Design a protein around this ligand. Sequence first.
Ligand SMILES: NC(=O)c1ccc[n+]([C@@H]2O[C@H](COP(=O)([O-])OP(=O)(O)OC[C@H]3O[C@@H](n4cnc5c(N)ncnc54)[C@H](O)[C@@H]3O)[C@@H](O)[C@H]2O)c1
Ligand SMILES: NC(=O)c1ccc[n+]([C@@H]2O[C@H](COP(=O)([O-])OP(=O)(O)OC[C@H]3O[C@@H](n4cnc5c(N)ncnc54)[C@H](O)[C@@H]3O)[C@@H](O)[C@H]2O)c1
Ligand SMILES: NC(=O)c1ccc[n+]([C@@H]2O[C@H](COP(=O)([O-])OP(=O)(O)OC[C@H]3O[C@@H](n4cnc5c(N)ncnc54)[C@H](O)[C@@H]3O)[C@@H](O)[C@H]2O)c1
Ligand SMILES: NC(=O)c1ccc[n+]([C@@H]2O[C@H](COP(=O)([O-])OP(=O)(O)OC[C@H]3O[C@@H](n4cnc5c(N)ncnc54)[C@H](O)[C@@H]3O)[C@@H](O)[C@H]2O)c1
Lengths: 218, 215, 217, 215
Amino acid sequence: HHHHHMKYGIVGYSGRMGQEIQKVFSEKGHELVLKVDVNGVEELDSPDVVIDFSSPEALPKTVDLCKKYRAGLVLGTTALKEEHLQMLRELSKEVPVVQAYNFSIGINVLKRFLSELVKVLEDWDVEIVETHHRFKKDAPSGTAILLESALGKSVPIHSLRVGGVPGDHVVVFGNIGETIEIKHRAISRTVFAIGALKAAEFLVGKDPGMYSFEEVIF
Amino acid sequence: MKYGIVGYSGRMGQEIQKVFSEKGHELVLKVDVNGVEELDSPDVVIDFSSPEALPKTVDLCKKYRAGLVLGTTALKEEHLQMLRELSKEVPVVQAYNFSIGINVLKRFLSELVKVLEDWDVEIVETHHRFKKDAPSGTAILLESALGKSVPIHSLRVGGVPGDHVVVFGNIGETIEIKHRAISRTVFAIGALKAAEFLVGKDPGMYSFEEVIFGG
Amino acid sequence: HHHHMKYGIVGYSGRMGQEIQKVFSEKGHELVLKVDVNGVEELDSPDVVIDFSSPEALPKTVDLCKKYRAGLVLGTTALKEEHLQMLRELSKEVPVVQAYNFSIGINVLKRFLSELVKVLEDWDVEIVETHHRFKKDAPSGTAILLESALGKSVPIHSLRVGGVPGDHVVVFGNIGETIEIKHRAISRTVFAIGALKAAEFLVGKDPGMYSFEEVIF
Amino acid sequence: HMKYGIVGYSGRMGQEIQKVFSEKGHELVLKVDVNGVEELDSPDVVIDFSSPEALPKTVDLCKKYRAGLVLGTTALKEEHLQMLRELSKEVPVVQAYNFSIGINVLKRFLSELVKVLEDWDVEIVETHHRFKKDAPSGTAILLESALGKSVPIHSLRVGGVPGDHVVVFGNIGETIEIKHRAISRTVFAIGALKAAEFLVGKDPGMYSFEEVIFG
Ligand SMILES: NC(=O)c1ccc[n+]([C@@H]2O[C@H](COP(=O)([O-])OP(=O)(O)OC[C@H]3O[C@@H](n4cnc5c(N)ncnc54)[C@H](O)[C@@H]3O)[C@@H](O)[C@H]2O)c1
Ligand SMILES: NC(=O)c1ccc[n+]([C@@H]2O[C@H](COP(=O)([O-])OP(=O)(O)OC[C@H]3O[C@@H](n4cnc5c(N)ncnc54)[C@H](O)[C@@H]3O)[C@@H](O)[C@H]2O)c1
Ligand SMILES: NC(=O)c1ccc[n+]([C@@H]2O[C@H](COP(=O)([O-])OP(=O)(O)OC[C@H]3O[C@@H](n4cnc5c(N)ncnc54)[C@H](O)[C@@H]3O)[C@@H](O)[C@H]2O)c1
Ligand SMILES: NC(=O)c1ccc[n+]([C@@H]2O[C@H](COP(=O)([O-])OP(=O)(O)OC[C@H]3O[C@@H](n4cnc5c(N)ncnc54)[C@H](O)[C@@H]3O)[C@@H](O)[C@H]2O)c1
């Protein structure tokens, strides 16, 4: 289940997520050998795995680095487009890849449940309310989009950008007599960095291809 | 559909008329403590009255081969027996709670707790200031769905019809599942869904869960 | 307190209109005027008119109030500058109470939020409001009212779900903490009761615009 | 720039305090926890988030070094308050059961709001991480005191929740909830730093954290 002294890279090493990843990975004795952010690339040694929480525009560099080092990829960057998914599919023919818009247990558990619930609550009104810290660049959140896809239809998404909220999502179902709310809260960013570590450890030694974070966890 | 109401004059009965008429259904049979009024043949009968009314209800359903949605509480063994005999001839849905949401959630929570078995779980329930019993029966039903004893916290404030919250937590995350009863209309809506389900069905007893889930 | 008022309802057939009839009749007041999208029914002269309908109805409301010199309790939301002007003109002749929210809690909170925003001036603030699926206006009047108590425009998020009578949440956030101030109308009856208080207040008053805060505080 | 001590240096709050204080360039010269005392130099101020049983040592150290005290430990008893008063004749002290801006702003607002909503029912729901030893929380007690009367407190002990408090007011027709959430424990350490900087150079006595914030 675990790997000893992995060498790893981070794309987005300087950002919020990047620094959480360094803290979590270093505590488990893993070694940072590759740093990429908007200001450059720093290659110190060959990574076994690369972790990317940055921006979609960075993904070409990320993929090239993974190909260069035959390093697996844990990708958390949100707001990916079709072009980005194609690049990942190409990469996955060479290395193991885990791409997820949310590295928590609870969102991935709920996303499955919501796919079943929506079928029984098909005639109820449904909206999503998501809340994140003030400087989050993307709205709606990737996670809101992920939950909307689990619902199997387009729903109103409301995005709050407030304080230092790590990430809350609420799915609201309503009928004339009652309401149901399904709420998830990430207590800190560390929970995503721990998910990323689980995914990294899963990937090491795997054959090439795309793996779901659900497979990582279930 | 053509439908009847036993208890048409009561709180629930007036709520049923509103909800059914809004969907374009036709009231053709009215029963209360003061009498029976047969206007046309009902496809389904809806009963929220009193256990003493059930004999007449059963008789009417047999007469018109009409299905029955039964919400009357405090039924005795004798009432259950009448109901079983009726269900040999017509389709029947009996439930002591037609909140659709609570029923849906109770199943959902039985599955969710297995996945989140190492998460801490508590219940917070809120009712109006006069509610005599704590914890509420719904909180006890939800605890039973969770398959284990959990802390239940009971707030008694103002005129709240009924809220229930199941809180799951681990070190890095929290999940809350909440249900809010806006009002008595929630049960009339449940009864509408059961009525529409029952139309055209083969005789027998159907659980409200299978109304909501297609078994 | 005024015994056996004669009153009219604009919007008598709507959700609020029916709640008004129930609340007013229970206090022994008499409905003498009914106005809806389908017509006008004048049975007797009203002392007061209660309007929870649509801004398009306001011209007829005003005309009726002028005709019978009847005061006006107005709850209709999404009023425009033209509607406010017709109201001002009306209030030269009769007493008027216009409010986007007739509950105790919201009116208590609005004062509390004016003070709280001053102390939490550097915190981010947004509003989340929730109403039933058929509500025609977004954002709600009450959200606008709350913004105005905060002394600034803020993001308002409007959910239109099921049968929710009316929820409003003001969210304040800092880097290390959040505060939410939430109000829930358990039923629509709370607004009809507010309207009744406002109607009783208005009877015998001199012409002008009166705030519902004045009605209650 | 300050020399400071921490009672509870090894705990959750203790490690947060070290991070926040060292980032502002303050120097840790005294470490106390359940396994011992480590005196490196004389502190100007001591910060104590530990256990009520540690308070005697905390007091003795502050007297020894004539150091101010910032005390966050909860579940203090009359005896602990007495020792603290005695200490405060010699040094400046800030004791608080919550070091967040939001709670100390709300407590004042709840004192006024409860007067206006005197006939509304009121309860408190508080939620903290699974390991919290004391229930109800000191903050819940503080809020109850701002409300000027005894109120039902419901305590959830779930996962890793830093600290949530909800004051629920209810009437027949409406409800009001006033909720505070501590996003991380850092917020309390930052409060403790504000308190420690306030205390420097102050006359002896007890100062409220509200005075530290000025309102
Ligand atoms: N999947 C998950 O569980 C999850 C969780 C949290 C955040 N995220 C996502 O992670 C991403 C980063 O979030 P954050 O809060 O750390 O943002 P951030 O702004 O703090 O960090 C961005 C990092 O990316 C770098 N960067 C930005 N654009 C770049 C470019 N075009 N080329 C190279 N480097 C670039 C920055 O220099 C910085 O190091 C976002 O897309 C966010 O939504 C995903
Ligand atoms: N299952 C649910 O979802 C649900 C929810 C709420 C209430 N209930 C139940 O519904 C029933 C009705 O509740 P309610 O609040 O409408 O009460 P109610 O007192 O307002 O109405 C009672 C109705 O029953 C009629 N009735 C009583 N005895 C009768 C008799 N023997 N013969 C014919 N009619 C008779 C009355 O005439 C009246 O119309 C109760 O048993 C209650 O427990 C069920
Ligand atoms: N101020 C408050 O405390 C408060 C509280 C609740 C609702 N409201 C407001 O009350 C108003 C109506 O709410 P509702 O839920 O009752 O609406 P509704 O749709 O249920 O009823 C609308 C009523 O207005 C009538 N109407 C519509 N257009 C008309 C016209 N051109 N001329 C005459 N009558 C017309 C309809 O026939 C109906 O009787 C809205 O503006 C709503 O936002 C205010
Ligand atoms: N006032 C506030 O703003 C606030 C905020 C958070 C926590 N707290 C309180 O702070 C205290 C500590 O919380 P925590 O979560 O960091 O607890 P913790 O369990 O992580 O740490 C307790 C610390 O105190 C030490 N300790 C215990 N008994 C001792 C003794 N007899 N002598 C010397 N040291 C002893 C431990 O070694 C440890 O260093 C609690 O009382 C908690 O309620 C207060």
